[PDB]
Design an enzyme around this catalytic site. Structure first.
Site, PDB file in Angstrom:
ATOM      1  N   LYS A 279       0.875  -1.247  -0.117  1.00 13.12           N
ATOM      2  CA  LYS A 279       0.083   0.250  -0.043  1.00 13.12           C
ATOM      3  C   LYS A 279       0.746   1.300  -0.162  1.00 13.12           C
ATOM      4  CE  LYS A 279      -4.817   0.385   0.635  1.00 13.12           C
ATOM      5  NZ  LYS A 279      -5.558  -0.303  -0.541  1.00 13.12           N
TER       6      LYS A 279
ATOM      7  N   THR B 124      -3.941  -5.600   0.501  1.00 14.55           N
ATOM      8  CA  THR B 124      -3.293  -4.302   0.684  1.00 14.55           C
ATOM      9  C   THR B 124      -4.226  -3.365   1.660  1.00 14.55           C
ATOM     10  OG1 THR B 124      -4.181  -3.327  -1.095  1.00 14.55           O
ATOM     11  CG2 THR B 124      -2.188  -4.478  -1.634  1.00 14.55           C
ATOM     12  N   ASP B 125      -5.520  -3.543   1.540  1.00  9.31           N
ATOM     13  CA  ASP B 125      -6.493  -2.927   2.793  1.00  9.31           C
ATOM     14  C   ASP B 125      -5.795  -3.452   4.082  1.00  9.31           C
ATOM     15  OD1 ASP B 125      -9.096  -1.384   2.730  1.00  9.31           O
ATOM     16  OD2 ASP B 125      -9.288  -2.953   4.386  1.00  9.31           O
TER      17      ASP B 125
ATOM     18  N   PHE C  33      33.090  29.346 -10.547  1.00  8.65           N
ATOM     19  CA  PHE C  33      33.071  28.138 -11.374  1.00  8.65           C
ATOM     20  C   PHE C  33      33.956  28.522 -12.618  1.00  8.65           C
ATOM     21  CE2 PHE C  33      31.733  24.745 -14.322  1.00  8.65           C
ATOM     22  CZ  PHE C  33      32.344  23.792 -13.782  1.00  8.65           C
TER      23      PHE C  33
ATOM     24  N   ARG D 125      29.050  34.110  -8.711  1.00  8.14           N
ATOM     25  CA  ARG D 125      27.745  33.660  -9.504  1.00  8.14           C
ATOM     26  C   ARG D 125      26.965  33.417  -8.303  1.00  8.14           C
ATOM     27  NH1 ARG D 125      28.293  27.348 -11.738  1.00  8.14           N
ATOM     28  NH2 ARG D 125      28.843  26.673  -9.302  1.00  8.14           N
TER      29      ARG D 125
ATOM     30  N   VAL E 279      29.932  22.929  -7.244  1.00  3.43           N
ATOM     31  CA  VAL E 279      29.169  22.040  -6.388  1.00  3.43           C
ATOM     32  C   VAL E 279      29.643  21.130  -5.539  1.00  3.43           C
ATOM     33  CG1 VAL E 279      26.714  20.859  -6.359  1.00  3.43           C
ATOM     34  CG2 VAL E 279      26.902  23.198  -7.654  1.00  3.43           C
TER      35      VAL E 279
ATOM     36  N   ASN F 170      21.486  22.247  -9.639  1.00  2.00           N
ATOM     37  CA  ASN F 170      22.261  23.483 -10.080  1.00  2.00           C
ATOM     38  C   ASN F 170      21.083  24.304 -10.499  1.00  2.00           C
ATOM     39  OD1 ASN F 170      23.963  25.910  -9.982  1.00  2.00           O
ATOM     40  ND2 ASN F 170      25.379  24.983 -11.376  1.00  2.00           N
TER      41      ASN F 170
HETATM   42  O1  LIG Z   1      29.375  23.882  -9.954  1.00  4.58           O
HETATM   43  C1  LIG Z   1      29.198  23.511 -11.101  1.00  4.58           C
HETATM   44  N1  LIG Z   1      29.553  22.269 -11.633  1.00  4.58           N
HETATM   45  C2  LIG Z   1      29.497  21.740 -12.751  1.00  4.58           C
HETATM   46  O2  LIG Z   1      29.724  20.625 -12.974  1.00  4.58           O
HETATM   47  C3  LIG Z   1      29.023  22.651 -13.606  1.00  4.58           C
HETATM   48  N2  LIG Z   1      28.902  22.461 -14.972  1.00  4.58           N
HETATM   49  N3  LIG Z   1      28.479  23.697 -15.173  1.00  4.58           N
HETATM   50  N4  LIG Z   1      28.268  24.761 -14.347  1.00  4.58           N
HETATM   51  C4  LIG Z   1      28.621  24.045 -13.164  1.00  4.58           C
HETATM   52  N5  LIG Z   1      28.785  24.144 -12.100  1.00  4.58           N
HETATM   53  O1  LIG Z   2      -5.706  -7.165  -7.360  1.00  2.00           O
HETATM   54  C1  LIG Z   2      -5.558  -6.936  -6.063  1.00  2.00           C
HETATM   55  N1  LIG Z   2      -4.483  -7.428  -5.428  1.00  2.00           N
HETATM   56  C2  LIG Z   2      -4.109  -7.223  -4.186  1.00  2.00           C
HETATM   57  O2  LIG Z   2      -3.031  -7.647  -3.622  1.00  2.00           O
HETATM   58  C3  LIG Z   2      -5.261  -6.639  -3.235  1.00  2.00           C
HETATM   59  N2  LIG Z   2      -5.255  -6.533  -2.128  1.00  2.00           N
HETATM   60  N3  LIG Z   2      -6.366  -5.523  -1.974  1.00  2.00           N
HETATM   61  N4  LIG Z   2      -7.150  -5.558  -3.110  1.00  2.00           N
HETATM   62  C4  LIG Z   2      -6.365  -6.106  -3.984  1.00  2.00           C
HETATM   63  N5  LIG Z   2      -6.585  -6.397  -5.307  1.00  2.00           N
END
Ligand SMILES: O=c1[nH]c(=O)c2nn[nH]c2[nH]1
Ligand SMILES: O=c1[nH]c(=O)c2nn[nH]c2[nH]1
Ligand SMILES: O=c1[nH]c(=O)c2nn[nH]c2[nH]1
Ligand SMILES: O=c1[nH]c(=O)c2nn[nH]c2[nH]1
Lengths: 295, 295, 295, 295
Positions: free
Chosen positions: C10, C57-58, C159, C176, C227, C254
């Site tokens: 779920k 799943t319920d 950079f 920058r 970075v 970035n």
């Molecule tokens: O910090 C940065 N890292 C990168 O790899 C990069 N490439 N373009 N600008 C950038 N700035």
């Molecule tokens: O098709 C279903 N599968 C499940 O595992 C399920 N569990 N609740 N309802 C369901 N329906």
């Protein structure tokens, strides 16, 4: 101080409904997200702590499910009208209801060239929406829309002849890429109430289809002078084809694709007529809006 | 302390390329997002501040555009192989390149039943991806995948016979909704280098198509006993139909749709055989994974 | 075909817990999102449709709530150890449990200079996470991390001296902006089981605090050569200050801020020493990773 | 058909500015996202393809950077007023400018109890926003807001006495969790133009601070009868403390945290006075809005 305006309700209510044709075994599904906000004589809940006037938002949620169980949920213009009418008819002190519906796509799968009876695919993030305002004594106002429709054409778009001054660096062009996400809204003439909305039910899906078709065909076939000019052509045709529409509104980003000069690297030619590799830009973007009505 | 592992590069590089058939006037577009990370004899940039061993990430970005200008960008397995081979062949101290590519859909529009020459639509958020690891002296390892494929079937899914103990409240069912977002990965046999990848170019698109078709048809036609059982059926067919695949991996959420009991309201019947309105649940969700290989 | 690997469970289980000091009236809240995946002798659910081996799943969801009701939920390394041990001890055929926990911040409000007894604010989107793998017969492996910590320094980053060749256009710089989102993971020595994890409970919060403090102080005070070089300094100090850690991993984008040349407009000076207005870039971004261990 | 309304411009313009005190060596940074839309005599760009009336959106982008280079960018009410006045004064046919600004937090780091001269942290996703509408012949309308402020109190919230009918299932309570994301907007009296905005510059930051302080203190200290009642108390104090404000608008989701009944499991007590473990709900959510003005 005084309360000048107030509304409250439930948002983000997800709903699914299935329809099963007992005869053919064919099933059809609908999924939407619903928002309902109410207005009325509710000011004392804010100023005096009087909760007696409040319809709890949890109850609004319940009402949405019950209404969907007992009525059709398509077209969404009809379902929204039914739901907002309920609240103003049911509660004496509630005089307006605002209903927003987003319809999600569940498109029937074709398997081996044949349409499958009960399996679906979300074939796009495009939505069909409605905004329905129901106001006591003033009828039902409906705005219908399509949103999330993303398109691109790789040629037959131009932009030249714009204003040039000392703030201008953009060059004129006669061949560029045009890409946008379409937001289009058509506003219906006011309806007096549910009976009138029901009498027009057939026009709702047909007009949504027309709006889509016209948007797509005009975008593909227009040799565009600008976003402004192309979107006006779309709005005009739609108005021409459905007389119950009063206004058409378009909101269109211009999602830029920039040329990349590679000439610094071995004289590589990648601009103008040799442009082949472009850099899509996430931001900023142009934003162009238009509301068109009848003259 | 010592450096035990290190890689660095450029992520989120968006790329578009257009192809124009001078003869027919038909254009075709490709859009992707690219990530390239390098490994090698670069530890002193971390420990001694020696930038001499660093290929700047800006230069990696440039390299991606230049490579796309000079080579085909489809299928993505080929383009990724070409790009990662460049870095290990070009720089003596770089011994591995990791290339991730996401392909975005641009599907040709049909206008008036005819396919348009230069207009496209994003008909879905489904992606086609590749992960290509190029390692000096050890060939090229390719994992291909489809992701974002969202489906639902409204019947012909079951879940009964599971373990029941004092933590269990879930009821057995013979008819339920099944919805998922498909993530499927097929891993190719190791390739000795670019010539071998090129000799198989035709199999890449055909296998992606097969993987999609099998996923769709099995989901729609399997009367599913569980997510576990249905996904195993998909993986098995794919392996059966392409001998160059070594493993198939599926990762499938179970997006729950819950029944809503409305009987508290006027005896309304909305559960079991009368279930028509459901509540989609945003969270939590089941998550089920399987890797299937040859026996 | 055969199953080569399989896990299921779920995801996206949201949990809140409150603690109330009856004596002082002071309350303390905890909120987290939990994922639990199980492995074991469960292959026949995939190949034979045998659901008998499946813990639904319920039920897993239920178990998470019950465990939180009956045990401390802080530090998260302890709560995850307790929860994964439960599944492998409770079910004979389940031999591994994988527990991921994301802790959300709820920081006590200060009102009028005094700390409030029961009101909190989400003062940041930074997370505290744990990954706990519990494997039958092989103890408990814990990776702790902080993520989402977003910082910027406006000067004292450099950079220069990187490789320059025909793919290179980037200029060297001695001043920058440096901005990143910090992802830092410290991996603990294997623990034999719950008693040993409990004997070290005090070190978990103190080491998270140390990791944070060292990350912040080194970023602010290092006159950074790259970075790569700055992140190595962080990893080294952390290892020096907690002997139960075996490796430290950093993953740092970035996030570029570009100068804007405005000289085309009235000779405005906005580059180099006159740089005052910059354009933050959403994409692409550099990505730099390092794993540091003991020598 | 006719054009009934039209506006166009540039959205999502990211801007950073640094200020450097040559004397103390202390630096201060500002980062924002800007949207500028223009209105005027521009209809023929839509109906006749006349681009001559269009100020290109790229030029608008340039203008934003140049204005930020030559003027203060704080408070944002001042910077937005300056920028929108430029467009209507510079272009004769442009008669309105709409400027939206989102301010991002960059909070000075404290290292060893001392504030650092040039290092910052994004200590929250809370925003400070302005909407400035500049209209030729009608002055400058400013709406200021704070958004994204996320809070929770674990007790001293109540909700009883609401309407109960056949759609109602919610139970009354005298002790519940209240959590919301605050959206608060204060609208200033109309200003005749830039000189008047400049004469009030000191009130903009002080009122933002007051609005924040009042929101926080009232949320923590009010023994809340409802969301409606608590938010009215906030709006009232703000109006009382700044006479140049005409209206205050609040929009508050109610993010529900549900009790979990565990009594099915060994009689575990986890409801009402024994409630300790809760399930945060992602959706649906209550939505409550109020506009308060002077009486
Ligand atoms: O910090 C940065 N890292 C990168 O790899 C990069 N490439 N373009 N600008 C950038 N700035
Ligand atoms: O098709 C279903 N599968 C499940 O595992 C399920 N569990 N609740 N309802 C369901 N329906
Ligand atoms: O279609 C366009 N409309 C505009 O208003 C514009 N401005 N820049 N580019 C543009 N393209
Ligand atoms: O404060 C609240 N206001 C409401 O209007 C409401 N409705 N349900 N719960 C609620 N809580």
């Amino acid at each position: 101080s005084a309360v000048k305006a107030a509304r409250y309700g439930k948002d983000n209510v997800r709903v699914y409904k299935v329809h099963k044709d007992e005869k053919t075994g064919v099933q059809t599904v609908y999924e939407m997200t619903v928002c309902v906000l109410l207005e009325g004589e509710i000011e004392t809940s804010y100023t005096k702590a009087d909760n007696s006037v409040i319809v709890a938002t949890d109850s609004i949620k319940n009402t949405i499910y019950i209404t969907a169980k007992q009525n059709p949920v398509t077209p969404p213009e009809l379902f929204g009208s039914i739901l907002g009418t309920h609240f103003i008819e049911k509660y004496n002190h509630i005089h307006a209801a605002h209903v927003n519906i987003v319809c999600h796509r569940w498109t029937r799968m074709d398997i081996d060239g044949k349409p499958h009876p009960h399996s679906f695919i979300r074939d796009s993030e495009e939505k069909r929406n409605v905004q329905v305002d129901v106001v006591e004594g003033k009828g039902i106002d409906i705005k219908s829309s399509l949103s999330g429709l993303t398109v691109l054409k790789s040629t037959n778009s131009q932009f030249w002849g714009f204003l040039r001054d000392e703030y201008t660096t953009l060059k004129e062009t006669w061949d560029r890429i045009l890409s946008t996400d379409v937001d289009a809204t058509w506003q219906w003439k006011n309806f007096s109430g549910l009976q009138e909305v029901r009498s027009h039910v057939p026009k709702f899906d047909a007009t949504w289809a027309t709006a889509r078709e016209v948007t797509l065909k005009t975008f593909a076939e227009d040799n565009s002078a600008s976003v402004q000019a192309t979107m006006y052509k779309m709005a005009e045709q739609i108005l021409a084809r459905q007389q119950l529409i009063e206004t058409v509104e378009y909101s269109l980003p211009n999602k830029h694709y920039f040329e990349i000069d590679l000439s610094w690297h071995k004289g590589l030619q990648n601009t103008g007529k040799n442009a082949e590799v472009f850099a899509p830009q996430s931001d900023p973007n142009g934003l162009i809006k238009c509301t068109v009505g009848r003259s």
